[PDB]
Design a protein around this ligand. Structure first.
Ligand code: K
Ligand code: MG
Ligand code: MG
Ligand code: MG
Ligand code: MG
Ligand code: ZN
Lengths: 99, 42, 38, 69, 177, 133, 71, 162
RNA sequence: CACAAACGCGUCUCAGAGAUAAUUAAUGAUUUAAUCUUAACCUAAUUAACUCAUAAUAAAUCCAGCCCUAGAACAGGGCACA
């Protein structure tokens, strides 16, 4: 009985572990986890938390670029709000729709 | 005054030898980032 | 003193004053008017 | 990506830019996994064994085309 | 990194010493970052089973600044076990007796409540003032920033700043201050 | 060649002794009252070692005083070796005294019952009579 | 970067007791009891003292002789 | 500013008042049509206990506060300024605005405990021996409710009771 | 009290500093008066707790045997002149 219930919790526990590693590797660059995720999705980069944790440990340079990408995207969002809202979408904020 | 290799270690003497190991691996073109061995049909 | 809930001035010489976080009715002519909020 | 560069997709990279090939090795079955449900003092036990078919892949080469706008 | 297998593992799981000043810093904000470093929640290689953990050195713990009236309202209570041995000590009284007790108790309550809390508390070094042994000083790596920006008093403002800030009102000439 | 002697200062503490309890005697005062006195004899008292102020307590220095002479053949190897360097026979009981820096005595200096002058009030510390379970 | 502290134990590593007799490799030992030994190691490695004691035969025997090894 | 001078010259006492030149208001305020000084310079809902440069212009040389009639502040802002000055003194700022007493500085006491955002006074709060569970919790006040209208750049409301 | 001891009915000894609650008073502003102040600075008179000064403890690694005012066992103190 404990085998099956833990098997259900195995997926939850590993997901929690990945977020801690992503948060730890994101705070190292001065960017919080909530800001690193939403501002990466706005760039249409669909990477799950499993591979982001792996990039954090074994790819220190690449994870910096993703962190650098998120910070640049976030700083563009604030500029639009600060303006009149009629600013053309940022050079990184442009949405590309495949159809 | 140009960095070519860097190695960690328990002590300075052990770390310094590891620095030479990294330098030799880079000079001999036998690093861990090297192009993987080609196995395609010739 | 007289520990009471609501403070009222029994004579015109009673003066309110807030000390130690509570309101005290201090009177000079009649010491029996001294009251203390609980 | 490599040591000195990294390419991001939105959300996918074109087939003309990077080619990845893999070779199938083993088509096997997983070890017996046990799934049991039990409820107290109601006399309800259900035991079933799951054997999930599995496939092992070997990734051989990853190539990057030099075509990039 | 082209390191050998042994030195590569040693470098990744290295212990790092941190320095954290405490001059006019609340213990709660001091303990929040200190708890993370002790656990290892800043390393992307973190895992509870692994022994990852970093030493933290906190100096000037006599000059902590409790926010609000917590110096007289917050109390620390303990029981010696014997009947009639229930002692409640105000925050001000405890800090006057044991200078590092306020910070140590704050961290001791924020770490995870497993059996590793005793192990990871041994790596925490507290000093009432800037009197650190030379052995501890040589182990440090970097200093963590202060979590609270210390406001400056009136006498610390330069005369250039005083003249720059506008005079809001014009007092009458006949008033006696 | 003893250590230098300093004049008395307020708040200074002296060095005690180790004595042997003989028995009790009755004693009478000039007002007719009767008092009971306990005979404490000092047999062999020598200061053994001196501990610096910062190595014992941080406030007052510590002076070590030994008891009466005992046989060499029933003491530990370290205990016999310690007394050999000083040059004294082994002692029975060893106690630690808290002494200020202005009343330090060179180790190996004998002490006598004249250390206490009549009229003074003194304390006594010893193991009481054990009555078992 | 700072220069390598090469001669830190320069005299400690190689000390000649005398120039008339050969050097002696006499590693003096105290062999402290289990009590003082554990508290010496715990202070050395900045750990507690509860993990330096051994365990019973039951826990020792159930450890896997050949743990799986990756890489 | 006017000051009073009392002189004793051989069983004769002379008391006279002398006028000292007073600094004036800055020439150009951003909002000339304002009424009270605080909202005339667009300082409404933008100052806190830290702003010593503002709170040092509505206080006496010995730590007291000037009356609302002289300054001209509105009642709503005057109470907020009064609260900030009280919090500033307890926080340790404004060290030159204490009265001078040569006899009392020599007998030092227990070192000052650093504090900030103290709503009450140090001598009028009693320890919370029986705190209580989460459904009836005695919360230690921090800051004052008079400063809950200040602008919040983060957007989260200020936590006054914690 | 028919043991060389135990025992009471007998004899001996029993402490300084900080710190506080209600309350009382000085200086003083919002309120140029006054006003002990969940106004500031300094300062005064003041319950019991409580905390501490201080005192007790202190030597790593003779120990078969015998003795002991040490003791259930195990430990502990003596065994050179006695
Ligand atoms: K008043
Ligand atoms: Mg007995
Ligand atoms: Mg007045
Ligand atoms: Mg004590
Ligand atoms: Mg013995
Ligand atoms: Zn009245």
């Amino acid at each position: 009985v404990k085998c099956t219930r833990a098997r259900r919790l195995k997926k939850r526990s590993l997901r929690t572990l990945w977020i801690n590693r992503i948060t730890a590797a994101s705070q190292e660059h001065g960017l919080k986890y909530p800001a690193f995720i939403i501002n990466l999705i706005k760039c249409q980069v669909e990477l799950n938390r499993k591979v982001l944790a792996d990039l954090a440990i074994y790819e220190p340079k690449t994870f910096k670029s993703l962190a650098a990408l998120a910070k640049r995207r976030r700083e563009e969002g604030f500029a639009a709000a600060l303006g009149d809202g009629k600013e053309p979408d940022g050079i990184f904020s442009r949405v590309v729709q495949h159809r | 005054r140009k960095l070519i290799a860097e190695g960690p270690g328990e002590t300075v003497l052990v770390a310094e030898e590891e620095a030479a190991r990294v330098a030799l691996r880079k000079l001999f073109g036998f690093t861990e980032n090297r192009r993987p061995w080609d196995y395609s049909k010739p | 003193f007289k520990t009471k809930g609501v403070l009222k001035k029994r004579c015109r010489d009673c003066y309110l004053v807030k000390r130690r976080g509570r309101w005290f009715i201090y009177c000079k002519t009649n010491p029996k008017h001294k009251q203390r909020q609980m | 990506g490599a040591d000195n560069f990294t390419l991001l997709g939105k959300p996918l990279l074109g087939k003309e830019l990077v080619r990845v090939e893999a070779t199938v090795i083993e088509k096997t079955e997983s070890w017996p996994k046990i799934n049991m449900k039990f409820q107290k003092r109601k006399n309800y036990q259900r035991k079933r064994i799951t054997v999930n078919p599995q496939t092992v892949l070997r990734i051989n080469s990853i190539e990057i085309a030099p075509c990039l706008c | 990194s082209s390191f050998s297998k042994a030195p590569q593992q040693w470098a990744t799981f290295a212990r790092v010493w941190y320095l954290l000043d405490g001059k006019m810093q609340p213990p709660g904000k001091l303990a929040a970052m200190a708890s993370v470093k002790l656990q290892g929640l800043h390393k992307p290689v973190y895992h509870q089973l692994s022994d990852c953990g970093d030493h933290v050195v906190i100096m000037n713990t006599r000059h902590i600044a409790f926010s609000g009236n917590k110096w007289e309202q917050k109390v620390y209570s303990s029981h010696t076990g014997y009947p009639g041995g229930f002692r409640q000590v105000t925050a001000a009284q405890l800090h006057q007796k044991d200078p590092v007790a306020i910070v140590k108790l704050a961290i001791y309550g924020m770490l995870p409540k497993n059996l590793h809390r005793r192990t990871m508390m041994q790596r925490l070094h507290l000093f009432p003032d800037e009197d650190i042994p030379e052995d501890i000083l040589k182990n440090l790596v970097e200093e963590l920033p202060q979590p609270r920006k210390v406001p400056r008093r009136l006498d610390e403002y330069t005369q250039e700043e005083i003249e720059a800030f506008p005079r809001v009102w014009s007092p009458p000439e006949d008033y006696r201050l | 060649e003893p250590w230098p002697i300093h004049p008395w200062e307020p708040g200074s503490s002296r060095v005690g002794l180790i004595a042997l309890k003989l028995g009790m005697m009755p004693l009478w005062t000039k007002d007719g009252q009767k008092h009971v006195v306990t005979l404490l004899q000092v047999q062999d008292c020598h200061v053994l070692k001196y501990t610096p102020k910062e190595n014992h307590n941080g406030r007052m220095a510590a002076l070590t005083v030994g008891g009466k002479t005992v046989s060499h053949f029933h003491k530990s190897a370290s205990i016999l070796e310690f007394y050999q360097e000083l040059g004294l026979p082994p002692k029975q009981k060893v106690k630690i005294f808290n002494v200020t820096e202005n009343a330090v005595i060179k180790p190996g200096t004998p002490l006598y019952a004249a250390h206490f002058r009549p009229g003074q009030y003194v304390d006594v510390t010893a193991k009481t009579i054990g009555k078992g379970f | 970067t700072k220069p390598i502290p090469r001669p830190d134990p320069v005299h400690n590593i190689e000390e000649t007791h005398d120039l008339v007799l050969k050097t002696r490799l006499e590693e003096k030992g105290e062999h402290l009891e289990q009590g003082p030994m554990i508290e010496q190691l715990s202070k050395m490695f900045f750990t507690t003292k509860h993990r330096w004691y051994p365990r019973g035969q039951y826990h020792r025997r159930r450890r896997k002789p050949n743990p799986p090894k990756d890489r | 500013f006017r000051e009073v001078v009392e002189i004793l010259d051989g069983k004769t006492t002379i008391i006279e008042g002398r006028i000292t030149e007073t600094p004036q208001e800055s020439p150009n305020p951003p909002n000339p049509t304002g009424q009270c000084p605080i909202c005339r310079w667009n300082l409404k809902h933008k100052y806190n206990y830290e702003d010593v440069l503002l709170l040092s212009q509505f206080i006496r040389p010995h730590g007291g506060m000037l009356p609302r009639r002289i300054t001209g502040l509105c009642q709503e802002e005057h109470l907020k300024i009064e609260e900030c000055v009280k919090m500033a003194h307890r926080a340790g700022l404004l060290p030159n605005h204490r009265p001078k007493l040569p006899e009392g500085f020599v007998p030092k006491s227990k070192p000052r405990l650093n504090r900030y955002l103290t709503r009450w006074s140090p001598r009028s709060v009693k320890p919370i021996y029986n705190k209580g569970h989460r459904w009836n919790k005695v919360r230690m006040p921090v800051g004052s409710p008079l400063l809950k209208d200040n602008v919040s750049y983060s957007g989260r409301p200020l936590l006054l009771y914690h």
